[PDB]
Design a protein around this motif. Structure first.
Motif, PDB file in Angstrom:
ATOM      1  N   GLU A 150       0.584   5.318   6.118  1.00 38.04           N
ATOM      2  CA  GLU A 150      -0.359   4.271   5.748  1.00 38.04           C
ATOM      3  C   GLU A 150      -1.799   4.665   6.056  1.00 38.04           C
ATOM      4  N   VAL A 151      -2.018   5.465   7.100  1.00 41.50           N
ATOM      5  CA  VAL A 151      -3.357   5.897   7.492  1.00 41.50           C
ATOM      6  C   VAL A 151      -3.303   7.361   7.913  1.00 41.50           C
TER       7      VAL A 151
ATOM      8  N   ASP B 286     -14.877  -3.639   3.241  1.00 38.27           N
ATOM      9  CA  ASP B 286     -14.022  -4.453   2.378  1.00 38.27           C
ATOM     10  C   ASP B 286     -13.407  -5.675   3.021  1.00 38.27           C
TER      11      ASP B 286
ATOM     12  N   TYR C 185     -11.906   2.312  13.620  1.00 37.15           N
ATOM     13  CA  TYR C 185     -11.247   2.862  12.441  1.00 37.15           C
ATOM     14  C   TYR C 185     -11.543   2.048  11.188  1.00 37.15           C
ATOM     15  N   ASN C 186     -11.606   0.740  11.307  1.00 38.48           N
ATOM     16  CA  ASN C 186     -11.869  -0.109  10.164  1.00 38.48           C
ATOM     17  C   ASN C 186     -13.309  -0.558  10.167  1.00 38.48           C
TER      18      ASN C 186
HETATM   19  C1  LIG Z   1       1.743  -1.887   7.589  1.00 37.05           C
HETATM   20  C2  LIG Z   1       0.848  -0.846   8.286  1.00 37.05           C
HETATM   21  C3  LIG Z   1       1.402   0.057   9.193  1.00 37.05           C
HETATM   22  N1  LIG Z   1       0.601   0.984   9.814  1.00 37.05           N
HETATM   23  C4  LIG Z   1      -0.741   1.023   9.544  1.00 37.05           C
HETATM   24  C5  LIG Z   1      -1.295   0.125   8.641  1.00 37.05           C
HETATM   25  C6  LIG Z   1      -2.808   0.171   8.338  1.00 37.05           C
HETATM   26  C7  LIG Z   1      -3.258   0.263   7.008  1.00 37.05           C
HETATM   27  N2  LIG Z   1      -4.646   0.304   6.725  1.00 37.05           N
HETATM   28  C8  LIG Z   1      -5.576   0.254   7.765  1.00 37.05           C
HETATM   29  N3  LIG Z   1      -7.004   0.297   7.469  1.00 37.05           N
HETATM   30  C9  LIG Z   1      -7.464   0.034   6.148  1.00 37.05           C
HETATM   31  C10 LIG Z   1      -8.749   0.837   5.877  1.00 37.05           C
HETATM   32  C11 LIG Z   1      -9.399   0.427   4.555  1.00 37.05           C
HETATM   33  N4  LIG Z   1      -9.641  -0.993   4.501  1.00 37.05           N
HETATM   34  C12 LIG Z   1      -8.386  -1.696   4.641  1.00 37.05           C
HETATM   35  C13 LIG Z   1      -7.751  -1.440   5.997  1.00 37.05           C
HETATM   36  O1  LIG Z   1      -6.538  -2.173   6.097  1.00 37.05           O
HETATM   37  C14 LIG Z   1      -6.729  -3.609   6.238  1.00 37.05           C
HETATM   38  C15 LIG Z   1      -5.361  -4.294   6.518  1.00 37.05           C
HETATM   39  C16 LIG Z   1      -5.577  -5.783   6.746  1.00 37.05           C
HETATM   40  C17 LIG Z   1      -4.279  -6.559   6.699  1.00 37.05           C
HETATM   41  S1  LIG Z   1      -3.317  -5.799   7.981  1.00 37.05           S
HETATM   42  O2  LIG Z   1      -1.987  -6.323   7.926  1.00 37.05           O
HETATM   43  O3  LIG Z   1      -3.899  -6.124   9.248  1.00 37.05           O
HETATM   44  C18 LIG Z   1      -3.282  -4.028   7.838  1.00 37.05           C
HETATM   45  C19 LIG Z   1      -4.752  -3.696   7.719  1.00 37.05           C
HETATM   46  C20 LIG Z   1      -5.145   0.163   9.074  1.00 37.05           C
HETATM   47  N5  LIG Z   1      -6.101   0.113  10.126  1.00 37.05           N
HETATM   48  C21 LIG Z   1      -5.677   0.022  11.437  1.00 37.05           C
HETATM   49  O4  LIG Z   1      -6.622  -0.028  12.484  1.00 37.05           O
HETATM   50  C22 LIG Z   1      -4.205  -0.022  11.747  1.00 37.05           C
HETATM   51  C23 LIG Z   1      -3.719  -0.124  13.220  1.00 37.05           C
HETATM   52  C24 LIG Z   1      -3.276   0.028  10.707  1.00 37.05           C
HETATM   53  C25 LIG Z   1      -3.723   0.121   9.369  1.00 37.05           C
HETATM   54  C26 LIG Z   1      -0.493  -0.808   8.016  1.00 37.05           C
END
Ligand SMILES: Cc1cncc(-c2cnc(N[C@@H]3CCNC[C@H]3OCC3CCS(=O)(=O)CC3)c3[nH]c(=O)c(C)cc23)c1
Length: 136
Positions: free
Chosen positions: A42-43, A93, A88-89
């Motif tokens: 995922e990352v 968006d 990290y985030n």
């Molecule tokens: C199901 C799952 C399992 N493992 C990792 C992810 C993931 C995936 N994306 C990330 N960052 C991106 C970077 C680009 N902008 C969108 C962000 O994700 C937002 C999303 C919000 C809903 S959430 O369920 O909290 C997962 C993160 C993450 N950013 C993070 O800090 C973490 C800890 C996870 C993550 C999701």
């Protein structure tokens, strides 16, 4: 002897307390993203950005490995979970704002539970136990 026995009892109930707190955080659905280590699929670049990853499951493991002598050391790893999400985030968006707000919520919740439910004199005894062990 008696000193070592009284020290182990104090830490045993500290671990019981922190283990109950960590369970209350993982079961909170808002913090589900922080309850397990990330999936690199995922990352894929997460380990190039975050040098010290942390999650609630790893916190439980460190509780059972007797890594925490104080509640503050426990909160340092909760704070690490949050600051890692803020690093990290980026504030871009809409999905980014969601996880960043959940990270600060997780940090505020954990500090407020400790502050309300941990006796300050039990905590100071933990702090004294740690300082004695670090310098002996
Ligand atoms: C199901 C799952 C399992 N493992 C990792 C992810 C993931 C995936 N994306 C990330 N960052 C991106 C970077 C680009 N902008 C969108 C962000 O994700 C937002 C999303 C919000 C809903 S959430 O369920 O909290 C997962 C993160 C993450 N950013 C993070 O800090 C973490 C800890 C996870 C993550 C999701």
């Amino acid at each position: 002897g008696p000193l070592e026995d009284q020290e182990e009892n104090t830490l045993r109930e500290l671990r019981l307390f922190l283990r109950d707190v960590t369970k209350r955080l993982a079961t909170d659905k808002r913090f589900n993203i922080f309850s397990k280590p990330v999936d690199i699929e995922e990352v894929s670049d997460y380990l190039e950005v975050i040098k010290e990853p942390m999650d609630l499951s790893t916190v439980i493991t460190k509780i059972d490995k007797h890594n925490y002598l104080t509640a503050k050391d426990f909160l340092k790893d909760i704070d690490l979970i949050c600051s890692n999400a803020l690093e990290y985030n980026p504030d871009k968006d809409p999905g980014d704002k969601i996880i960043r707000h959940r990270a600060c919520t997780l940090k505020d919740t954990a500090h407020a539970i400790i502050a309300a439910e941990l006796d300050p004199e039990f905590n100071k005894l933990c702090e004294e136990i740690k300082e004695a062990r670090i310098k002996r």
